[PDB]
Ligand binder design. Structure first.
Ligand code: HEM
Length: 153
């Protein structure tokens, strides 16, 4: 449900993430886990991190943040015509990783916070509104797929 100009604002600030995907991805998962501690409990591999300093040092957390934002970028570049990219993620998150839809709101919040924290000058009011709409469209489509698969949306 985005306009073409709102997709361009999203893809233009996504270019800042592409200049450093793993660094943004690491900061998103740290913000997700420090903001909403219960999300960390879905990651069996990341329990042992008892602090933001242990999370910062974890090369596996950084590698997983990289994988997370590389997939999200694949989804955003499709501008809404993203069913083929979205399906595999809704499949794996609804079944194997046991992620509720609400946790998707939390990581959406962490992404905006990261973008605002790292690019305050480039991520103004128009870019913010457009990225919020993009992440809402992703969340909504993820939830519709979960319902299709027999899960709570
Ligand atoms: C923008 C939203 C998200 C994206 C793009 C994303 C993407 C991914 C990708 C690409 C993988 C590896 C492939 C796969 O298994 O599907 C993955 C794994 C995983 N995701 Fe996400 N994810 C998102 C949100 C979440 C949230 C909010 C949680 C938990 C609160 C979560 C939990 C996990 C877990 C537990 C795994 C498996 C990790 C492991 O290797 O041990 N994901 N995610």
């Amino acid at each position: 449900g985005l306009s073409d100009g709102e997709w361009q604002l999203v893809l233009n600030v996504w270019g800042k993430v592409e200049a450093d995907v793993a660094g943004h991805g690491q900061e998103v998962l740290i913000r997700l886990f420090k903001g909403h501690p219960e999300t960390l409990e879905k990651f069996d591999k990341f329990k042992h991190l008892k602090s933001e300093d242990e999370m910062k040092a974890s090369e596996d957390l950084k590698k997983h943040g990289n994988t997370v934002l590389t997939a999200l970028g694949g989804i955003l570049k499709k501008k809404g015509h993203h069913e083929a990219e979205l399906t595999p993620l809704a499949q794996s998150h609804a079944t194997k990783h046991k992620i509720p839809v609400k946790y998707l709101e939390f990581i959406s919040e962490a992404i905006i916070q990261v973008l605002q924290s790292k690019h305050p000058g480039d991520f103004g009011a128009d870019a913010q509104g457009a990225m919020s709409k993009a992440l809402e469209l992703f969340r909504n489509d993820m939830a519709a797929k979960y319902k299709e698969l027999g899960f709570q949306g």
